[PDB]
């Protein structure tokens, strides 16, 4: 039988009257039921992650001049890559991005593997005006990525993302041997095609554990990149995976004190123009080297300079707040004022924390579970 | 008949050049009335233009 060939639904039978006017009570119940439309979690997916050393390979062949994506594939690809780099560094604190451009059967390492987003964005903007010629070489790009990532620590997840526009690749040697070597090296390879499905990309993605997708339009391209942003699930505990990193305090210099010492920034020292000789900035806790941008690994002593708030922003996932016990107002024989907003409790349901047994209204409960991520009573 | 009709109007439509009629008022000699009034009568459409001359 069919669902719609039976009896027609009467959704208006829910409302009923006993005292001629209880519709106000019904609409109050409906308004209360309208709230709490979430699961008390902003993400609700992967609550953790792992250090990812991701390499992004961009096709630089003549096929990038095609106008499937306005204005051409290269410009849309680089714009979406800038967006992807920004989002990936936003959602991954201690990750690194490398960019490889393959052209004329050779692969050029456009950018070193590091955690600076500004350098990658500047490199992409510079590469916007590149010359699209020749044919891509997946073998050379994968060889460069494997050579770079072979010496990386085992606990980090090694990933390669390939943007393959051209349907043909030139390999100076057998590629399936390289795929076997990558599989033995536990390097994940993901490919996002632009024209159509290529067998070698499917085999590579299946064997290395990655995913192979083909772009339908620019929105689908952005969706695939956004999916690639998310970190992979992390095993319980592998080994002593740790890392020596510093937390450079942003100590600026004021001439009101006698210790106002101007210093050139190491990052700005490599620029053609005059480096910024500002009063202060981020001083390395180990060698007192000065940097302006974070997170940037120290050039001198090799220490990783990260920002503590960036690491702390993900701490609420480790310790989620347990849902408060929903209690009807009549059954709660205690105070009738919310502990968070001091407002009078007039809702039919009152939420009580399991730890401190305090009183929270619906709005304060939603705010605590969604945004605050901490019980105000438990803090005291 | 159709193939001669579709071409007989090509030359007919290209003969006429001006459609709007020129309506310039060509007033004749002025007539002097009382109180220094002067009236001009159009010789093409009979338009009367009465004016006071300083």
């Amino acid at each position: 039988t069919k669902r719609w060939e039976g009896g027609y639904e009467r959704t208006w039978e829910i409302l009923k009257e006993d005292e001629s006017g209880s519709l106000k009570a019904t609409i109050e119940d409906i308004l209360f039921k309208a709230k709490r439309k979430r699961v008390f979690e902003h993400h609700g997916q992967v609550r953790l992650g792992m250090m990812r050393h991701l390499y992004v390979v961009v096709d630089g062949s003549r096929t990038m001049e095609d106008q499937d994506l306005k204005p051409n594939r290269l410009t849309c690809t680089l714009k979406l890559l800038e967006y992807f780099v920004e989002e990936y560094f936003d959602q991954n604190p201690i990750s690194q991005i490398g960019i490889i451009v393959t052209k004329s059967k050779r692969a050029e390492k456009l950018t070193e593997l590091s955690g600076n987003p500004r350098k990658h964005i500047t490199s992409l903007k510079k590469a916007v005006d590149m010359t699209c010629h020749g044919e891509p070489s997946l073998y050379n790009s994968l060889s460069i990525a494997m050579q770079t990532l072979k010496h990386m620590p085992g606990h980090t997840s090694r990933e390669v993302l390939i943007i393959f526009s051209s349907l043909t690749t030139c390999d100076p040697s057998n590629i399936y041997d390289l795929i076997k070597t990558l599989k033995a090296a536990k390097i994940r390879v993901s490919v996002i095609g632009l024209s159509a499905e290529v067998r070698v990309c499917t085999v590579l993605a299946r064997e290395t554990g990655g995913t192979y997708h083909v772009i339908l339009d620019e929105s689908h391209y952005k969706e695939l990149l956004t999916h690639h942003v998310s970190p992979p699930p992390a095993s319980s505990s592998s080994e002593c995976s740790l890392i020596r990193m510093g937390f450079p305090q942003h100590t600026i210099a004021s001439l009101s004190d006698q210790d106002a010492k101007p210093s050139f920034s190491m990052a700005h020292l490599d620029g053609n123009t005059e480096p910024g000789l500002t009063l202060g900035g981020y001083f390395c806790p180990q060698c007192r080297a000065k940097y302006c941008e974070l997170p940037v690994e120290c050039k001198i002593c090799g220490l990783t300079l990260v920002s503590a708030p960036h690491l702390a922003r993900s701490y609420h996932h480790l310790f989620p707040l347990d849902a408060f016990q929903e209690i009807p107002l009549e059954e709660y024989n205690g105070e009738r004022f919310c502990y968070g907003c001091q407002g009078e409790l007039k809702d039919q349901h009152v939420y009580v924390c399991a730890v401190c047994q305090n009183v929270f209204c619906v709005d304060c409960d939603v705010f605590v579970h969604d945004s605050l991520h901490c019980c105000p009573g438990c803090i005291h | 008949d159709k193939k001669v009709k579709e071409l007989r109007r090509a030359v007919r439509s290209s003969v006429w050049k001006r459609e709007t009629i020129v309506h310039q008022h060509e007033y004749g000699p002025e007539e002097n009335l009382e109180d220094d009034m002067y009236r001009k009568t159009c010789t093409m459409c009979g338009h009367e233009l009465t004016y006071e001359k300083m």
Binding site: - | C42, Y51, E52
Partner: protein, 66 residues
């Protein structure tokens, strides 16, 4: 010298008034002097009939929803 009311309007309405002058829709040639592409000189004794005609033209191609 001429005495009357100067009318300032869009060029389309100036052409409409010029057409009304020659069409004798008012009974006479009271649209006497044209001075500018957007300005005309009209006798003041029957400025109301021009208002009525313009209003009729305006609400003719309006389709009031009443």
């Amino acid at each position: 010298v001429l005495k009357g009311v100067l009318i300032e309007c869009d060029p389309a309405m100036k052409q409409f008034l010029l057409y009304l002058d020659e069409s004798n829709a008012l009974g006479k040639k009271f649209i006497i002097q044209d001075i500018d592409d957007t300005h005309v000189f009209v006798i003041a004794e029957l400025v109301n009939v021009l208002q009525e005609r313009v209003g009729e033209l305006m609400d003719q191609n309006a389709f009031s929803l009443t």
